[PDB]
Design a protein around this ligand. Structure first.
Ligand SMILES: *[C@@H]1O[C@H](CO)[C@@H](OC2O[C@H](CO)[C@@H](O)[C@H](O)[C@H]2NC(C)=O)[C@H](O)[C@H]1NC(C)=O
Ligand SMILES: *[C@@H]1O[C@H](CO)[C@@H](O[C@@H]2O[C@H](CO)[C@@H](O)[C@H](O)[C@H]2NC(C)=O)[C@H](O)[C@H]1NC(C)=O
Ligand SMILES: *[C@@H]1O[C@H](CO)[C@@H](O)[C@H](O)[C@H]1NC(C)=O
Ligand SMILES: [Ca+2]
Ligand SMILES: [Cu+2]
Ligand SMILES: [Zn+2]
Lengths: 115, 96, 1233
């Protein structure tokens, strides 16, 4: 019983992952922003038990990494949006186990425009 | 990390086409999954030749430097887990 | 071989079946109960007979016990095992043990929540001579007084290898017999109330179920328990006890005494088990034994005619000395409301024939006691008895089971046991005593053993009237010198009323319970004489046997001594002989010491009250010189905490010269001596010469009881003068005889005491006491006068009453009434873990001389927690608690298994909480490590001196520092440098250099070392004795290191080096070799390759052909081609793993990178996962969070990384997260087992 989640909203351009059934801290979490039509790229791995992060060259200025321990949740904040995609996952801290990207994100809608 | 031929549809139970090619030497750290239209993402192949848990036992091969019925409609992306930064794939589109 | 045990109410003591808390609706106690399982909810059936007693534990050598305790009580409880080894995770006691908080959970277990794990190593189990299964116990150790007094005590059985043998389960039985007093008014639960002397927790004969089968044998694992002194003389009506391998009539037990006695049941029936001490309070200790059925030349006949008949008995046939402000008068002089010295009593009297009209030979010296009754095994004694008295008396022997009437076997009336059937002032009875085998000795003990008879129609007042006489029992003048220690209580003697009439001015003056008159007829007698009226002549070199009994009022034990002499006890020469009530022992000694001596009591307040008598004998390669004096000092009995009065004492110290001015200061090896005199050590056949000088206000003496004076002055017997006036300087000289030294079957070195004897009791409490070792053969030698093969310590257990110490009036120094802050339960004069000087090497025998002295309270029950020792008397027995009695000076040896800081207690619960405790440190000799002096872990600010020359600052004294000016240096003659390690540490050595200045070579050629614990208590390191102090040899030049070592390692936190000889200038760079207190600093074998390449394993490993960076090579400082580990790919998910095979206490991680080619690689950041199984993992969280450890900054410099608080695990993984160029690891691990 390993499950993931994500709070399923939009805003104007230029404006500022829950899980249960396992150990929230001792496992890496990874974000993703699958651009429309292309494929799946990469964000950064958050270790919710310490804060160690390894971001990606692209979202380097837009992939901040925060979380909270006594709640089992992890968020991601980005500033100044551009006019939009659709799409987290889990990796282990040691090599050998099979808890690597087994459960995937619940998907979330995201839009950037001013209708 | 690209896919070949990234577009070779089929039907239910023959030899189609879904193969991954890596930029550099990875040695073992490749995967392969499935995309459902409503956003459902699962996992199957991992560590080249290894089976999954809640997935059937039908899919899976590897060789430096390449690797790889039922609800047959997805875009198979491969996974590269050898060094940061990581990256998925290009996408092999199919339709029944 | 993993035995699992799951230990975890109201009690009235007589009502059995209150242990039905398992399942009948009809004091507060907390006891130990068992369970079936690891889920803590299911009760077991426990037998009838165990009562309150905790579960009996059985095991073997090389197994492991695994108890899980769950506290389900009001108060907290621990689990403290006796006589096994444990890991400090399992000691169940809290004290200044310097122990991580994880290892202090055991110390106190709160409601809810602890497994313990005990080891039973090969050195833990019994020897060949020992019983098949040693008797130990376990208890709660959070508040001994409380915990015991509430029901926390179970049995511990440690048997040799071979329990899985088919015992004939008709026999065996073997019931643990806790003999525990409970003081229910001072247990946990309470608000005096009463105090229950029990057997297995039941009073008044009520213990059910102890049934044994007839023609078989039963073993007894015996455990005494109790939180004050008080002794118990335990008997079984028709039966004898076999202990060690000796026929004993009683069991001599006392608080936490442990025995395995066996006895043999020849008579069908039911027999009373009971304690025999005069004090009827002691009279809950009473249980029944039922014996049943289960399933599947030529022997002499001796004839004696003995009559009970009345006489006038004189206790003092030598007039005393009317002077009555000195008690002496009261017990013996005649006048007002005092009787005197002639009391009418009844005795046993031997006659010559059936007519009883003529008396056989009386004999002065044996006064009061009846005729000597000899009888070898097999013989028969016809004791023809005629009365001639007024009350109906009787005569019956305690010792022989088979005592029927002569001719007939059937008894006159409803007489259960012949014991209470009386004889009638004018009847004759004919008795047949037949001496059988089961009454006699047992090869391993002496030829004869001492017993006694007495009337039993009314046991108490008959014996008190004077019906007593000796009965020997032996194996297949003549029999002579019989010494009867007997308090005759004339306040119970039938003739009390008659005596008043004949000897008083007016029988009118009634009073009756006037306590002076009452206590004026308690003649404290030896045989029948008092205040020195029993004088007995012996000759010189007369080889004499001594038959010794204790029958009287008495109640308390007697600790009997002969001056100047040394008897043979259990085939071993000792010096005092402790005797319980109704007990008798045979000793054997040769009268080699001319002089007048006093036999007497040592027990303080009998001895003053009359129990004396005189012994009057008289005829008819090296020289080891010690300089010792009695000098006065101040003494606080312990400074540490608790509101600090200081007391004036007087003590023995060793000096060097005849000119008593250079006092040969001691330390390290003798710090522990405390209030005790110096070790004066001789071998056998060399000579001892002590020049003794009295300083001090009062006069004092040097007496030992080995002091053997020669046959000078022939005119008469002589009181040995002794008595050194406060300034005089008497000298004692005497050769040491083979009989003053260890038998070939004892240990290399026997201990004997020495003290003043101008007032035995008063001036030991003042402080005059020391150990006199007598070593064996050619073992003790060198210029050290010591074994050196073995570390030796002396521990003197006693409870100083500073109210009794002479200088007590001189301590008006307080300001202007109960004593309980003037009494100190003090080992060697230090109380409450205050005693210093106890440092011992890892694995290395240690010999302990244990002494107690003083008042009757001192029956201490000494325990070495987590260790066991060996005592030796003709054979060698394993034990865990020796029941030290005053005046006895036993010698035991142990080796310390486990490193750490361990406690030395007295298991007398009252004494412990009153302070009677200390600790010792056992260190690994293999834990030498650099204390961080070169590595800069010790920050500059902790080094400190006293003058600096200039710019040559003490902050430079760091081994290998280079350049220009690069060290401390001072032009002052008397100087010092001082290093603050920042906390107490163990130091084993010091490495020493000195630099170059342009063209000179600067160095200390000769220094001395001072150290300190607080920062202004510096003491000079007189290491390894040598002399007044240790002069060390420094350097010979700039470059070289001189590596002096501390082989009594230094325990300190401030160390201070004093240059005494330099070339041109004192100048020093130094490094400190050492270890933490708990000996957790050493590598676990990366560098020594002690971890074979199969134990190191990783997630991947790059290989092509020319490299092959396999884990195996990732060891700190390895050199050459491809010298480190490289994961086949770089990513923060990889990990390296090490299977230690055992659980280890990892306390840090040293960590490295590698130089290769030109491109530099090292690991900037990593994390750590841990496991006990290898398939589950947890990251070492801390204060909340998943720790991220700092990394190397270069690919060559090692960096330490202490783990705090250090994890326990047998599996260790390193998870590198951020790196530089490439992941590359070399490391060491720091810790211990
Ligand atoms: C066990 O037996 C005791 C005596 O044989 C008995 O105690 C005595 O205690 C009471 C209470 O103070 C006294 O009144 C009485 O005089 C004592 N007997 C003497 C001094 O001979 C205990 O009560 C008995 N225990 C139980 C549980 O009944
Ligand atoms: C005093 O110095 C001597 C000389 O080294 C020490 O001797 C050896 O000590 C080791 C360590 O326990 C033993 O293995 C040897 O048996 C000793 N050598 C000999 C020749 O007997 C001695 O330990 C030092 N004493 C103290 C108290 O430090
Ligand atoms: C006696 O003791 C005192 C105490 O110090 C000392 O001064 C003196 O020299 C000693 N001898 C004599 C003869 O007084
Ligand atoms: Ca502990
Ligand atoms: Cu004690
Ligand atoms: Zn008793």
């Amino acid at each position: 019983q390993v499950q993931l989640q994500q709070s399923g909203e939009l805003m104007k351009p230029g404006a500022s992952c829950k899980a249960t059934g396992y150990t929230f801290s001792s496992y890496w979490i990874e974000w993703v922003k699958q651009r429309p039509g292309h494929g799946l790229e990469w964000i950064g791995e958050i270790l919710p038990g310490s804060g160690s992060t390894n971001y990606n060259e692209r979202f380097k200025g837009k992939a901040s990494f925060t979380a909270d321990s006594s709640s089992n949740t992890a968020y991601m904040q980005l500033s100044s949006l551009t006019s939009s995609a659709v799409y987290c996952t889990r990796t282990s801290y040691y090599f050998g186990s099979s808890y690597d990207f087994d459960v995937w994100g619940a998907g979330t809608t995201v839009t950037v425009s001013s209708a | 990390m690209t896919q070949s031929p990234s577009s070779l549809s089929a039907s239910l139970g023959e030899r189609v086409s879904l193969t991954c090619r890596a930029s550099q030497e990875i040695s073992g750290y490749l995967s392969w999954l499935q995309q459902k239209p409503d956003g459902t993402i699962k996992r199957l192949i991992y560590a080249a030749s290894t089976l999954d848990s809640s997935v059937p036992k039908r899919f899976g091969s590897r060789s430096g430097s390449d690797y790889s019925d039922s609800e047959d409609f997805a875009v198979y992306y491969c996974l590269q887990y050898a060094s940061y930064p990581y990256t998925f794939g290009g996408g092999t589109k199919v339709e029944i | 071989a993993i035995r699992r045990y799951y230990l975890g109410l109201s009690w009235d003591y007589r009502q059995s079946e209150l242990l039905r808390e398992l399942h009948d609706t009809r004091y507060k106690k907390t006891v130990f109960v068992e369970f079936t399982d690891q889920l803590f909810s299911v009760a077991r059936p426990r037998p009838p007979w165990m009562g309150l007693l905790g579960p009996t534990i059985q095991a073997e050598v090389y197994d492991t016990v695994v108890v899980t305790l769950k506290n389900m009580a009001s108060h907290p409880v621990s689990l403290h095992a006796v006589g096994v080894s444990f890991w400090k995770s399992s000691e169940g006691a809290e004290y200044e043990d310097h122990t991580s908080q994880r290892e202090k959970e055991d110390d106190k277990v709160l409601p809810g929540k602890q497994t313990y794990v005990w080891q039973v190593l090969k050195e833990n189990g019994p020897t060949a001579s020992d019983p098949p299964c040693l008797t130990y116990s376990y208890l709660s150790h959070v508040d001994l007084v409380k915990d015991l007094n509430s029901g926390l005590i179970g049995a511990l059985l440690v048997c040799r290898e071979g329990s899985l043998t088919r015992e004939r389960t008709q026999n065996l039985h073997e019931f643990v017999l806790l003999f525990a007093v409970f003081d229910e008014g001072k247990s946990w639960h309470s608000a005096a109330q009463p105090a229950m002397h029990t057997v297995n927790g039941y009073v008044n004969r009520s213990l059910p179920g102890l049934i044994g089968c007839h023609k078989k044998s039963v073993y007894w694992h015996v455990i005494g328990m109790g939180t004050s002194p008080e002794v118990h003389s335990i008997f079984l009506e028709g039966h004898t006890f076999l202990v060690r391998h000796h026929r004993q009539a009683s069991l001599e037990i006392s608080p936490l005494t442990f025995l395995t006695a066996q006895t043999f049941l020849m008579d069908l029936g039911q027999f009373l088990l009971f304690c025999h001490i005069s004090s009827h309070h002691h009279g809950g200790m009473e249980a029944h034994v039922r014996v049943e059925s289960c399933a599947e030349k030529h022997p002499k006949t001796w004839v004696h005619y003995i009559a009970a008949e009345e006489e006038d008995w004189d206790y003092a046939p030598l007039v005393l000395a009317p002077d009555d402000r000195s008690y002496k008068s009261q017990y013996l002089n005649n006048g007002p409301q005092r009787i005197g010295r002639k009391y009418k009593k009844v005795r046993f009297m031997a006659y010559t024939d059936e007519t009883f009209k003529t008396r056989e030979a009386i004999q002065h010296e044996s006064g009061i006691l009846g005729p000597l009754l000899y009888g070898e095994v097999g013989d028969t004694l016809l004791i023809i008895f005629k009365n001639q008295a007024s009350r109906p008396y009787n005569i019956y022997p305690h010792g022989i089971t088979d005592v029927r009437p002569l001719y007939s076997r059937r008894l006159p009336k409803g007489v259960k046991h012949l014991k209470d059937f009386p004889i009638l002032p004018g009847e004759i009875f004919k008795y047949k005593w037949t001496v059988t085998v089961e009454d006699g000795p047992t090869k391993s003990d002496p030829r004869c053993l001492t017993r006694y008879y007495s009337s039993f129609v009314n046991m108490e007042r008959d014996l008190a009237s004077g019906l007593i006489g000796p009965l020997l029992i032996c194996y297949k003048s003549d029999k002579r010198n019989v010494i009867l220690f007997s308090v005759f209580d004339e306040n119970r003697s039938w003739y009390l009323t008659e005596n008043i009439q004949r000897f008083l001015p007016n029988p009118a003056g009634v009073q009756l319970e006037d306590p002076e008159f009452q206590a004026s007829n308690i003649m404290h007698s030896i045989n029948g004489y008092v205040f020195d009226s029993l004088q007995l002549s012996v000759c010189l070199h007369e080889v004499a046997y001594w038959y010794i009994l204790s029958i009287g009022a008495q109640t308390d034990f007697l600790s009997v001594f002969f001056s100047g002499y040394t008897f043979k006890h259990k085939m071993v020469y000792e010096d005092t002989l402790t005797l319980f009530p109704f007990s008798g022992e045979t000793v054997f000694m040769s009268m080699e010491n001319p002089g007048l001596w006093i036999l007497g009591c040592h027990n303080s307040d009998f001895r003053n009250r009359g129990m004396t008598a005189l012994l009057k004998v008289s005829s008819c390669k090296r020289t080891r010189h010690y300089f010792i004096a009695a000098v006065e000092q101040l003494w606080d009995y312990g400074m540490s905490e608790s509101p600090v009065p200081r007391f004036k004492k007087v003590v023995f110290r060793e000096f060097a010269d005849g000119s008593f001015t250079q006092p040969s200061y001691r330390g390290e090896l003798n710090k522990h001596l405390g209030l005790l005199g110096p070790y004066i050590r001789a071998e056998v056949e060399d000579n001892i010469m002590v020049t003794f000088k009295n300083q001090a206000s009062r006069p004092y003496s040097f007496y030992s009881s080995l002091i053997s004076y020669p046959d000078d002055q022939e005119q008469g017997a002589e009181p040995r003068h002794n008595f050194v006036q406060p300034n005089e300087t008497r000298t004692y000289f005497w050769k040491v005889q083979h009989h003053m030294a260890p038998t070939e079957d004892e240990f290399d070195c026997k201990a004997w005491a020495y003290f003043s004897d101008v007032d035995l009791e008063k001036d030991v409490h003042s402080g005059l006491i020391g150990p006199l070792l007598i070593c064996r053969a050619n073992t003790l030698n060198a210029a050290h006068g010591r074994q050196v093969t073995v570390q030796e310590f002396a521990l003197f257990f006693t409870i100083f009453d500073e109210t009794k110490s002479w200088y007590f009036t001189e301590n008006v120094e307080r300001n202007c009434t109960l004593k309980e802050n003037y009494r100190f339960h003090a080992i060697n004069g230090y109380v409450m873990d205050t005693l210093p000087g106890l440092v011992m090497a890892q694995n290395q025998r240690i010999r302990w001389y244990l002494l107690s002295m003083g008042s009757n309270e001192n029956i201490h029950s000494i325990h070495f927690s987590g260790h066991v020792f060996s005592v030796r008397k003709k054979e060698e027995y394993k034990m865990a608690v020796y029941n030290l009695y005053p005046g006895v000076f036993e010698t035991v040896e142990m080796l310390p298994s486990k490193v750490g800081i361990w406690r030395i207690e007295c298991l007398i619960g009252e004494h412990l909480q009153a302070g009677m405790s200390t600790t010792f440190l056992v260190y690994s000799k293999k834990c030498q490590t650099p204390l961080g002096m070169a590595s800069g872990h010790i920050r500059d600010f902790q080094i400190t001196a006293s003058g600096q020359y200039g710019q040559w600052a003490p902050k430079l004294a760091r081994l290998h520092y280079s350049g220009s000016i690069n060290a401390w240096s001072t032009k002052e003659p008397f100087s010092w440098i001082k290093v603050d390690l920042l906390a107490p540490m163990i130091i084993h050595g010091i490495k020493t250099q000195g630099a170059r200045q342009k063209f000179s070579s600067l160095y200390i050629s000769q220094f001395i070392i001072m150290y300190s614990l607080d920062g202004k208590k510096w003491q000079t390191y007189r290491g390894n004795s040598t002399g007044t102090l240790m002069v060390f040899f420094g350097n010979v030049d700039s470059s070289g290191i001189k590596h002096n070592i501390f082989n009594p390692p230094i325990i300190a936190r401030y160390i201070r080096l004093h240059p005494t000889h330099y070339s041109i200038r004192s100048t020093l760079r130094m490094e400190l070799m050492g270890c933490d207190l708990n000996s957790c600093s050493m590598p676990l074998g990366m560098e020594s390759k002690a971890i074979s390449d199969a134990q190191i394993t990783a997630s991947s490993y790059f290989t092509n052909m020319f490299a092959t960076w396999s884990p195996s090579k990732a060891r700190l400082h390895l050199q050459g081609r491809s010298n480190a580990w490289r994961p086949q790919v770089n990513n923060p998910k990889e990990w390296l793993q090490v299977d230690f095979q055992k659980t280890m206490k990892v306390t840090g991680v040293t960590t490295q990178g590698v130089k290769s080619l030109l491109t530099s690689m090292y690991v900037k950041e990593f994390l750590i996962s841990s496991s006990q199984d290898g398939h589950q993992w947890t990251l070492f969280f801390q204060n909340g969070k998943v720790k991220v450890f700092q990394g190397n900054q270069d690919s060559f410099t090692p960096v330490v990384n202490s783990l705090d608080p250090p994890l326990l695990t047998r599996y260790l993984r390193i998870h590198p997260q951020s790196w530089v160029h490439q992941i590359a690891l070399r490391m060491e691990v720091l810790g211990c087992e």
